């Protein structure tokens, strides 16, 4: 799986912090406020990179956060360390790949009235040079229907 961005990591930390529970033991007084791992998962995968929020990752990366939170703190690494340069560089790479893909994509009066298209019609028995008015064509159709009926 792709590496975790510090932005989505701080987002996960805040989502866990917004569950009204402490990391010392994730079932605090008012035990009905058990940890909603699916909620923080939904809140995290809305970040820059791909979903990457299965049942495992949500617990694994929080258990990784706990040691380094109990070095710089996640909130400090978010406010510090080029706050928005990481996600912006990721998105710039994405846009560069987009442009490369879109660029390499493929771009995508000899009058000839040959005598074949007219010869087939002549063989069919109809004159092409002389346009038969629709009235005579209708009369011919009626005569053909009459012949068929007899």
């Amino acid at each position: 799986n792709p590496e975790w961005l510090i932005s989505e990591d701080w987002a996960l930390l805040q989502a866990v912090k917004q569950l009204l529970e402490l990391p010392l033991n994730l079932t605090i007084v008012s035990p009905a406020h058990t940890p909603n791992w699916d909620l923080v998962s939904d809140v995290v995968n809305s970040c820059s990179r791909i979903y990457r929020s299965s049942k495992q990752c949500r617990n694994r990366y929080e258990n990784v956060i706990i040691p380094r939170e109990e070095p710089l703190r996640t909130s400090q690494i978010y406010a510090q360390d080029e706050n928005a340069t990481h996600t912006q560089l990721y998105t710039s790479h994405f846009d560069l790949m987009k442009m490369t893909a879109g660029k390499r994509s493929p771009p995508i009066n000899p009058f000839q009235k040959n005598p074949k298209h007219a010869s087939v019609l002549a063989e069919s028995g109809i004159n092409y040079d002389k346009p038969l008015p629709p009235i005579q064509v209708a009369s011919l159709r009626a005569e053909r229907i009459a012949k068929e009926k007899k």
Partner: protein
């Protein structure tokens, strides 16, 4: 606790024993054991939710005593200290109801606070009336004494009932029923919140959100009535519940069945205005709801970079290539800005939008190779995109690696997607051909899809389209299973498997998705079919012995070619030519292909060239013509040559040559005279050259072409050609050449095709070309007697009524006119042919005449129309004087009204009704009323001629009459007077419901009237007391109808014409994308005119109007609905009192004050909120309202219809459909042309915009308007012909009306004036339609149109009677 209940659920004996054991453990010896209770919580909960009442009672009695008897303490307990995880898919909120109702006091008398519904006691009559009456009554056998004693004993027995007996039984009843108990919590929790003080409410609201999450309380995720759903509904239904996080709201909406409730809450937060998270979550949830329009509007409101708005506008209307280009430009500009300096983190959502929408666009544009190269990038592999776009290019190794990478991290919503991809892998992998687990994968995928379906709202919508599409590919995978099972060498060549393969291929060929689906799904289906088509082809190449006839490989080749051609056709229909050329270049790379499908490929190519030849260039069109001429025609058939020459003539008529095109059309029609399209296009070209050169020898030819094209084809297609035919009849000369032409070649055309145009040919029935049209209408009527009887009945009666006024000087009977005799001879012939059916129809019509009700509602409607006309004329005198005198016409109207005041075939029903009217006219009440009115309605006194004085007197009399007419019957039995209707039965005659033959249906299942229901109700609609008639059919369903008395034979006939126009335009909306995708359709009720004064219209019981809702809200507030107009006019008068003519600021401040004082813009919004308490129902109603309002606004703007007054708009509460009260073209009576140029294009008053919450307007409303504009703008539909055909008779009636005032020779208007006026009128609509259809640069004028529709600078100038505030 763990196993006894799992392995022995049915044997309730040991379960009850174990529950009694744990209850004893909890009850007795508590001082000794209190740690054991920790682990046995699931046992206690299960015993509490058991189905046995005694166990539940003994468990609740111990669960209640453990807590203080205080509502706040129990609420806090159940909200933060109690864990419901151990419950297990249970509706535990009923236990909350138990706990909250048990703490209530149950040692006091029972009572109720509903004083309005209190039942009076026996002795309550001792204090109601005055005193002395009862005082004298109080100072005034055994059979009665015993009764009184027993009754007093019984009453004493009742007074012993306490409130505790009610609550216990209420709770025991809520136990068994999950439904109607969720509602009890929803309705009781806010009541508890109301009594909680601020200190308690603050903490409770602050701790509810942790409880809304509550971690592992997710087993309810699959519960149909999930507990979190009810809890959040109740919490939101409170008054002060401000604090709730939008992220948790979106999570609950997605996971639990809270989609529409969550969206409503989020938008209610958003429209109250650190804070961008609300809009972010709302946009995410809208994109999750598949509601493209709302998402697009929200983002256009959020769009920072201008390129994003254009990209979203392009992608919203199917412009995928331009959308992709705009997205590329946008992200390039963003990359440049980033290289300049870092941007705020709030822009990341826009970047994700660009990413995913560029991915989607490239997916729609058949860029699978580019998508694979992108998702497979070394640094940022996107495994989901790769898994999606890998199998469509046969990259099975990449697909397998992406699958194994996704199966571990796939969203649970995409479980069925992962199953389908696993099946694709197992079926199509070269080195992993293991066809052992196939049906199991399909079963698991179907189960997961159904489980996801159970998580979606109950009202089907765009949210459910993904699963409805997935079903088809799942059943195809199931079929592919046996396909591959039969292609193996063990079964290869076997007839039993060959027949199954042939059948499955035929079914696939005959089973197709709909155009409303995106090209992505069409590709996902066709490419999946192509793999197995090729497998069939390849499988029959190494088994030359098996089936040695070169047929089964040809079968697969033909299947693949047909699938490719169908995919290209679908891509073309959606508006993609480049992908069409790509697919054509693809299909060209085959060793050999059939000759039948190559002709269809060439046909699709020439169709692409056709639809691309709108602004064709010389070079490109000549190259296309050369490519056309380069095709060989040696091994082809004959009819294909006819179609080819027809398309050639079309493409060359597109260019301004017109000679070789005529030759090619003639040659094609001679090659195959049965080819309908060729002859239709030839007739189109002939009509064009006739209208241009005006040669008589061409009109007959054009009409013959149209008729021969309409002969052998379906009516849906032939409609626009009959339209062209009917319009050409306005060019005939004195010799009536084209008349005899159409009369000579009409034998052969189906008679059903003329049903949709009976009114058009009836107007020509009165012209100099009569006799032949009479013969034709009689011939077509021999098959449909009623469809021709009703219209001729109405027209004959109208002609008789008109002649009665033309011969005012001659008393008694008079000689009939030529059209009268002409249309009555046909009725005589019909009665001779269909005597029973016509006699039953006559009986029905003569019985419904009894619906002439009385003088009360008659004079009420008369004075209502009088007040309406008074206001309409006063608006004209508003700005000038506003102290104006009544006009002569209005004076004559009111005089005639107050003089008649209600009393104004050889049949006997009319005579009996007149006798009854003269009889009931002998009472003194109505005589005294007439006297009092005449002593006031006289105008011969000074000071009463003022228009506003008349308006005030009319309002006074309106109030008096409405207070008088409130005591009348509301329904009557049909058997009282209508004997033939009550005695009507299916055995009498096979008569169909009125309005059935109007639109022909493919099937002949026409519901016949089984019998008329006995009850006939009276409903106040259209400012009149209409009579509602119910008719039942042989299917058991009931249809309601209103027998409306027009009282105006011209306005009703001009009104029911736009209904026919819309009904003709409705099919077209259903034949294009971006219209079916949005479910755009006109709601056109059925209206049939049975007589000049009466017409029968279809309706539904629950259909209010805007004015009805307004007056209902006013009565609720206790005010008069006529207050705002009177206030506007009072301000106008007081401003003009000092000579100053009211300026613009005057109107603006008047509107502002009347809106802020007595007409708040939030009236319709609160009305809708109260009407629809359910979030899903409210959302569906609002969406239907938005789309229907947009459609009718587009109609009333493009089509020059009268202003949509508020009382006209009918609003169906049961579906949300919006239909108006009979629009009509506002043709200028003076000039005779359409001049629909009001300040406001369509009704978008502040109340509506507030109901549409200001984003339904910017999104679905304008989106639907643009879609319907671009839809009708397509030339293939030829809506101009229908418009011309309708405007022909719309203007003929205008000319007839204008010439009647002065004074056969005058029976015909003119040979050149009528056509010129019709052409002038139709262009005014066509230009307005094209102006709206223009969508250059991702921008449209519809935005400026909707912006002007609600601008106060223009609304203030509208008519007060138009209610610019409602």
């Amino acid at each position: 606790m763990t196993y006894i209940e799992k392995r022995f659920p049915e044997d309730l004996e040991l379960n009850a024993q174990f529950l009694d054991l744990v209850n004893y453990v909890y009850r007795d010896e508590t001082l000794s054991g209190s740690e054991l209770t920790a682990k046995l919580e699931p046992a206690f909960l299960s015993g509490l939710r058991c189905a046995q009442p005694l166990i539940r009672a003994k468990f609740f009695e111990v669960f209640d005593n453990s807590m203080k008897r205080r509502v706040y303490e129990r609420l806090l307990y159940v909200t933060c200290s109690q864990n419901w995880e151990a419950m297990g898919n249970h509706f535990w909120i009923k236990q909350c109801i138990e706990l909250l109702l048990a703490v209530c006091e149950k040692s006091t008398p029972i009572g109720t606070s509903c004083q309005g519904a209190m039942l009076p006691s026996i002795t309550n009559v001792i204090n109601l009336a005055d005193s002395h009456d009862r005082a004298a009554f109080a100072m005034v056998g055994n059979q009665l004494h015993m009764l009184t004693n027993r009754h007093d004993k019984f009453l004493d027995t009742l007074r012993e009932v306490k409130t505790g007996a009610l609550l216990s039984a209420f709770v025991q009843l809520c136990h068994i029923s999950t439904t109607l108990a969720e509602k009890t919590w929803v309705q009781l929790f806010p009541r508890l919140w109301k009594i909680l003080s601020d200190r308690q409410q603050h903490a409770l609201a602050g701790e509810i959100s942790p409880f809304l999450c509550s971690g592992s309380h997710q087993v309810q995720r699959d519960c149909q009535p999930s507990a979190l759903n009810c809890f959040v509904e109740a919490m939101s239904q409170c008054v002060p519940p401000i604090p709730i996080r939008p992220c948790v709201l979106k999570y609950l909406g997605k996971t639990h069945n809270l989609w529409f409730r969550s969206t409503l809450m989020l938008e209610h937060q958003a429209f109250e205005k650190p804070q961008q998270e609300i809009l972010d979550s709302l946009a995410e949830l809208y994109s999750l709801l598949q509601e493209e329009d709302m998402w697009a509007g929200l983002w256009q409101k959020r769009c920072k970079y201008s390129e994003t708005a254009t990209a979203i506008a392009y992608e919203q209307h199917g412009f995928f290539e331009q959308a992709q280009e705009s997205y590329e430009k946008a992200m390039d500009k963003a990359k440049k800005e980033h290289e300049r300096s870092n941007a705020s983190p709030a822009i990341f959502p826009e970047y994700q939008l660009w990413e995913d929408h560029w991915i989607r666009c490239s997916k729609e544009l058949n860029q699978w190779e580019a998508l694979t190269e992108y998702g497979q990038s070394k640094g940022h592999i996107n495994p989901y995109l790769v898994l999606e776009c890998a199998w469509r290019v046969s990259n099975w190794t990449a697909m397998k690696e992406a699958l194994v990478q996704v199966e571990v991290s796939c969203p649970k919503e995409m479980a069925w997607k992962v199953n389908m991809y696993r099946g694709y892998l197992a079926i199509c992998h070269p080195e992993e051909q293991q066809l052992s687990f196939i049906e199991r994968l399909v079963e698991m995928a179907s189960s997961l899809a159904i489980r996801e379906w159970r998580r979606l709202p109950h009202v089907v919508s765009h949210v459910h389209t993904p699963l409805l599409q997935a079903a088809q590919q799942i059943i195809e995978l199931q079929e592919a299973a046996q396909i591959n099972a039969g292609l193996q060498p063990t079964n290869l060549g076997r007839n039993n498997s060959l027949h199954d393969m042939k059948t499955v291929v035929k079914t696939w060929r005959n089973r197709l998705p709909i155009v409303s689906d995106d090209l992505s799904h069409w590709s996902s289906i066709f490419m999946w079919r192509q793999h197995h088509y090729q497998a069939i082809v390849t499988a029959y190449e190494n088994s030359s012995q098996h089936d040695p006839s070169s047929n089964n490989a040809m079968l697969g080749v033909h299947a693949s070619a047909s699938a490719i051609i169908q995919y290209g056709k679908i891509a073309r229909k959606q508006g993609l030519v480049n992908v069409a050329l790509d697919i054509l270049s693809r299909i060209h790379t085959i060793p050999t292909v059939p000759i039948v499908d190559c002709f269809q490929k060439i046909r699709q190519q020439v169709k692409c060239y056709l639809q691309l030849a709108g602004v064709m260039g010389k070079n490109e069109c000549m190259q296309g013509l050369e490519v056309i001429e380069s095709t060989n025609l040696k091994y082809f058939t004959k009819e294909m040559t006819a179609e080819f020459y027809a398309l050639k003539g079309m493409f060359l008529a597109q260019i301004n040559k017109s000679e070789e095109a005529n030759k090619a059309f003639s040659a094609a029609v001679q090659m195959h005279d049965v080819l309908v399209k060729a002859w239709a296009m030839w007739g189109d070209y002939l009509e064009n050259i006739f209208v241009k050169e005006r040669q008589l020898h061409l009109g007959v030819s054009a009409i013959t072409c149209y008729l021969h094209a309409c002969r052998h084809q379906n009516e849906s297609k032939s409609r626009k050609y009959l339209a062209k035919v009917l319009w050409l009849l306005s060019f005939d000369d004195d010799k009536n050449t084209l008349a005899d032409a159409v009369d000579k070649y009409c034998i052969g055309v189906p008679p059903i095709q003329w049903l949709a145009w009976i009114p058009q040919l009836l107007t020509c029935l009165v012209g100099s070309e009569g006799k032949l049209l009479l013969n034709l209408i009689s011939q077509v009527g021999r098959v449909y007697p009623q469809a021709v009887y009703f219209p001729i009945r109405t027209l004959y009666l109208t002609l008789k009524i008109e002649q009665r006024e033309r011969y005012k000087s001659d008393p008694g009977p008079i000689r009939a006119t030529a059209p009268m005799w002409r249309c009555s001879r046909i009725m005589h012939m019909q009665r001779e042919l269909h005597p029973t059916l016509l006699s039953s129809l006559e009986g029905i019509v003569d019985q419904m005449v009894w619906f002439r009700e009385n003088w009360h509602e008659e004079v009420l409607r008369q004075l209502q129309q009088g007040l309406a006309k008074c206001y309409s004329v006063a608006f004209e005198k508003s700005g000038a004087v506003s102290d104006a005198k009544i006009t002569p016409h209005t004076l004559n109207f009111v005089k005639k009204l107050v003089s008649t005041f209600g009393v104004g075939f050889s049949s006997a029903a009319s005579e009996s009704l007149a006798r009854r009217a003269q009889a009931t006219a002998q009472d003194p009440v109505f005589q005294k009323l007439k006297g009092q009115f005449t002593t006031d309605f006289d105008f011969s006194v000074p000071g009463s001629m003022k228009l506003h004085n008349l308006i005030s007197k009319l309002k006074k009399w309106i109030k008096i009459l409405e207070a008088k007419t409130k005591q009348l019957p509301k329904f009557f039995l049909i058997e009282e007077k209508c004997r033939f209707l009550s005695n009507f039965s299916a055995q009498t005659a096979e008569v169909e419901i009125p309005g059935e033959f109007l639109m022909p249906k493919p099937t002949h299942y026409y519901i016949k009237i089984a019998r008329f229901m006995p009850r006939v109700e009276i409903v106040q609609k259209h400012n009149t007391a209409a009579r509602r008639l119910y008719i039942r059919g042989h299917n058991g369903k009931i249809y309601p109808y209103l027998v409306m008395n027009d009282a105006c034979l011209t306005e009703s006939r001009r009104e029911e014409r736009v209904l026919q126009l819309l009904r003709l335009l409705n099919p077209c909306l259903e034949k294009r994308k971006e219209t079916t995708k949005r479910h755009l359709f006109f709601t056109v009720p059925r209206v049939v005119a049975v007589s000049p004064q009466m017409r029968l219209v279809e309706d539904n019981p629950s259909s209010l109007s805007l004015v009805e809702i307004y007056k209902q809200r006013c009565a609720k507030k206790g005010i008069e609905h006529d207050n705002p107009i009177s206030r506007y006019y009072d301000r106008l008068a007081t401003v003009q009192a000092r000579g100053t003519q009211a300026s613009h600021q005057v109107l603006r401040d008047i509107l502002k004050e009347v809106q802020s004082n007595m007409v708040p813009r939030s009236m319709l919004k609160e009305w809708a909120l109260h009407t629809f308490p359910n979030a899903t129902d409210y959302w569906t109603f609002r969406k239907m309202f938005t789309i229907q309002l947009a459609l009718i606004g587009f109609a009333e703007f493009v089509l020059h219809l009268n202003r949509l007054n508020p009382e006209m708009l009918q609003i169906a509460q049961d579906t949300g459909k919006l239909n108006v009260a009979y629009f009509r073209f506002d043709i200028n009576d003076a000039t005779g042309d359409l001049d629909a140029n009001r300040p406001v294009p369509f009704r978008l008053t502040p109340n509506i915009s507030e109901f549409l919450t200001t984003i339904g307007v910017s999104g679905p409303l304008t989106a639907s308007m643009i879609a319907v504009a671009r839809c009708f703008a397509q030339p293939n539909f030829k809506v101009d012909g229908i418009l011309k055909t309708v405007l022909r008779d719309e203007i003929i009636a205008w000319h007839k009306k204008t010439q009647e005032d002065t004074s056969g020779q005058p029976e015909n208007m003119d040979s050149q004036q009528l056509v010129s006026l019709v052409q002038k009128a139709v262009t005014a609509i066509m230009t307005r339609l094209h102006n709206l259809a223009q969508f250059e640069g991702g921008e449209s004028k519809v935005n400026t149109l909707v912006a002007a529709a609600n601008s106060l600078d223009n609304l203030c100038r509208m008519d007060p009677a138009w209610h610019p505030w409602l």
